[PDB]
Amino acid sequence: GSLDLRARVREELERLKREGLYISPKVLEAPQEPVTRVEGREVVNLASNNYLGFANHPYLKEKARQYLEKWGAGSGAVRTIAGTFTYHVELEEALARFKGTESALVLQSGFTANQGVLGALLKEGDVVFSDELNHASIIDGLRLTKATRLVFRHADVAHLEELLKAHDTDGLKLIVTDGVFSMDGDIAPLDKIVPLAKKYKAVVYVDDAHGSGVLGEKGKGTVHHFGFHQDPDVVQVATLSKAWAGIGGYAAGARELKDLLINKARPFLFSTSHPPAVVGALLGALELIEKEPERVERLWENTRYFKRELARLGYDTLGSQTPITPVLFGEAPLAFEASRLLLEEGVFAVGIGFPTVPRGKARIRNIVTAAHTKEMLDKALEAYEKVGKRLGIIR
Amino acid sequence: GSLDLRARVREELERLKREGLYISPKVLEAPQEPVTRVEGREVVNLASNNYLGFANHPYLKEKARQYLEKWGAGSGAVRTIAGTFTYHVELEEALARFKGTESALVLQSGFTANQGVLGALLKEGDVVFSDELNHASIIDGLRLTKATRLVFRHADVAHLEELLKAHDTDGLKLIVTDGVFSMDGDIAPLDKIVPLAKKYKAVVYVDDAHGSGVLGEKGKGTVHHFGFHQDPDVVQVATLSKAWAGIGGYAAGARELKDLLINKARPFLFSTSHPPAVVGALLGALELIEKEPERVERLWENTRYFKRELARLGYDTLGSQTPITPVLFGEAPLAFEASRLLLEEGVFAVGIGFPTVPRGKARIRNIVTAAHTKEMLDKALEAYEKVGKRLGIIR
Ligand SMILES: *Cc1c(COP(=O)(O)O)cnc(C)c1O
Ligand SMILES: *Cc1c(COP(=O)(O)O)cnc(C)c1O
Ligand code: NA
C-alpha cells in the first residue's frame, strides 16, 4: 500500500506539529527597513540581515533602475552558454577590487555558491574539517562531494589540531567554517585557524555570509579583518543577500580558482545568471559603502549598545560578538511564544528552531543594523524587559 | 605531503584541458534578444532560453521598475524569517491561478527547487523511478535524499512498468522526469506515465523548465497540456528563468505541499527570497502572456518554419516536438566546427558533443523564440545551408 502525495505531506506536517517545530512565517507589508509593517502594525524589525540599511536605499534602487532599463528583465541563459553579459564582468571586476583578491566570481546564491565551490575543489580521498555549527548550505555542499567529512567542536582549535594530527591525505585538507556563525553571532578564530592550517598544509574555506559588509575596513570581511586576504590557501565565499542587500553569492581569490569554478561548479553550469536590476543594485552597494564607510561604524555602535543592555537585563547572548545578538529559549515553543509576545509590544524578532538551530537550542535572533535609531533599540529593549519578566527568564 | 590550493586548481584545469572539456564562455555585449552582439559582431541568437521574447520586453521592465521603486533593492532575509513580502504572495497567488494548481511556491532557482521539493517529499524506504536523461539538478536533489533510486530507459514506459512491478514500498513511489528534455527537444509521455502511476499507486514529479511558457494553452506547461494539472499526485517544478525570462523556480500542486516546502525545503529555509524587481517582472510576464497569448502561437509558427527548412535541406532534427531544435552532426568535432562556421555567418548557436551527449550523437542546439522574425530565421537557415554544403552533410 503506497502513499499518495497528500498522505505523505499530511504525515510530515503532523510530525512537525507534534515535535513543536511547525512554523507559520509572517508577511512583511512595507519595505525591508528597521521599522516595517507586520500584521497591519508598525514594528521595530530585528529579524532581517539588512546590516547596512541598503535593502531600501535610493542609491542602490537608482543603479538597479539604470541597468534594468538598459539591459532588461532577464539574462536568458547560464553563464557558460549565453548568460554572461558586460554587466556580470563589471560586477566581478568591482568585487575583486573591493575584496583585494586577484578575482571574484558571482554565483546565483550563497546557498549554491557553497555547493559550487566545495564541489569544484573536493575529490575522493580529500579530508574536510567542519566546525560543528556550520550553516546548512555547507553541509549540503559537502554531502554532494566524496570527501571524508570530520567535525570539530565549535570554534575549538585544540580539537581541530587533534583531528589535523590524526587524519592525513596525499589529497586536499579543507578546514571549513562560517566566518560569522549565522545563529550564534560569534567569529571564527581565524587568527589561530589559519596558522594551524599552514602548520598542517591545509586550505581554509570561510563562508563569510555574516562577515561580508560587517567585519574588516568598509566591511571587506572576516578574512580581511584577521589580515589573511592575500593568503593563497584561504578561500572566501559569501552571500550578496545580507549586508549587500540583493541576492547572489561570490567566491574570491586567485584567477586560477575562478577559472576552475567557471568549468566545474554545477550550480554555475546548470542555472541562469542574475538579471540586470540585481547586478546594478550590487554595483550601487559597492559604490555606496565607498562613499559612506561610517555605516559600518554606526552598525557597531548600535550593536555594542543593544548587546550590553540585553546582557544587563540578564539574558544569555551566547557570547555573540557581531550585530547578531541571540537570546536562547531552549524549547522551540518558548521561542515562538516569546516572539509572539514581542510582536504584541510592536517588536518583530522571530523565534528559530530545528532545522535552522539544534533541538532544545531554540532562540530569537536579533540583528542590529546601521539604520536602527536609539529610539528603536530602546523600544525593543523595553519589550525584552517586559516579556522576559512575564516569562520568568529574567528578574 | 598534502596539496595546496594552487596545486589542486592547477591539476583540475590541466585534466579538463587534456580531456577536451575546458570552456571559455563568450561575453554578450547587448541585451538578451533574438539579435544581439558577441565578440564585437551582430548575431542571430538561437542560444538563449528566451522563448516568449520577455527578457528585454518593455512591459516586464516597467513592472520591475514599479516594484523596485515601491519596495527597494533587497528582501534582506529568507522567506520563513523576515523575507516574505506582499509581492511574493501576490506572485504565488497569480502563479497558482495561472497554472490551475491549488498552490504555487517560488524558490531561489529551478536548480534548487529540485533539491527543495525532492528533499521535502522523500524519506528512506521511498522508491524513485528516474528517466535516464533527467537534468543534472534532479540528480543532485536525489543524492541529498535516502530514497532507493532506479533509472528507466529514456521515455520507455514498458521498462518503467517492469521496475514498478518489481519494487514496492509502504512509503512513496516517485516517478521523476523532465517535462521537455533539453537535448533532443522531446516531451515526456505523461499520457502513458500518469495512467501507469495510477495503476501502481505512484506519484509523478515533472521538471517542466522547458515546458513552462511553451506547452499548454498560454504556456501553462506540459502537465496542463496533458490535462493532469488538478491531480494531487502530480507535482510540477519549473524555472522562472527561461520563457518567464527572470530567475527562480516554482513548485505547483496540492495545497498542503506548499506548507510542507515552507517548513522543510532546505533551499527555502536557508536562501534569501528574490527582490522586488525580479518579482515585479514575473508578475508582468504572467499579465503579458494573458494579454498576448498569440506570442505562444508565434513561438510554434517560428519553430515549424525553422524545422521545415532544415528538413528540406536534408538535416535531421532528431524528432524534436518543441522549439528546442537540435541539428545532428554525428561526431563532436564536426558539430563544433559547424558551430564556429555558423558564428562566421553571424549565427550564434550551441555545439554539443560527448560527455554532454553520446559518441556519434553530437549536434548544434537551437532554441527558436516568439521574437525571432522570418528575416532572422532565413539568415540562420541560409547559414545552415552554406555550412552544411561546405561540411558535406547535405547536398
Ligand atoms: C545566509 C547564508 C548562506 C546563504 O546565502 P544566500 O545568498 O541567502 O543563499 C550561506 N551560508 C551562510 C553561513 C549563511 O548565513
Ligand atoms: C533550466 C533548467 C533547470 C534550472 O533552472 P534555473 O532556474 O536556471 O536554475 C532545471 N531543470 C531543467 C530541466 C532545466 O532545463
Ligand atoms: Na525598561
Numbering used by the authors:
A (entry chain A), B (entry chain D): 2 to 396
Direct quotes from the study:
We report a chemo-biocatalytic cascade for the synthesis of substituted pyrroles, driven by the action of an irreversible, thermostable, pyridoxal 5′-phosphate (PLP)-dependent, C–C bond-forming biocatalyst (ThAOS). The ThAOS catalyzes the Claisen-like condensation between various amino acids and acyl-CoA substrates to generate a range of α-aminoketones. Like other members of the AOS family, ThAOS forms a tight homodimer with the PLP cofactor bound at the interface between the two monomers, typical of type IV PLP-binding enzymes. We next characterized ThAOS thermostability, finding it stable at temperatures of up to 80 °C over 3 h.
We predict that Arg366 is involved in similar functions in ThAOS, allowing the biocatalyst to accept the observed broad range of AAs. The acceptance of acyl-CoA substrates ranging from C2–C8 is more difficult to understand since there is a lack of high-resolution structures of bacterial AOS:acyl-CoA complexes. However, the observation that ThAOS can use various acyl-CoAs suggests that the binding site is suitably dynamic to accommodate a broad range of acyl chains.
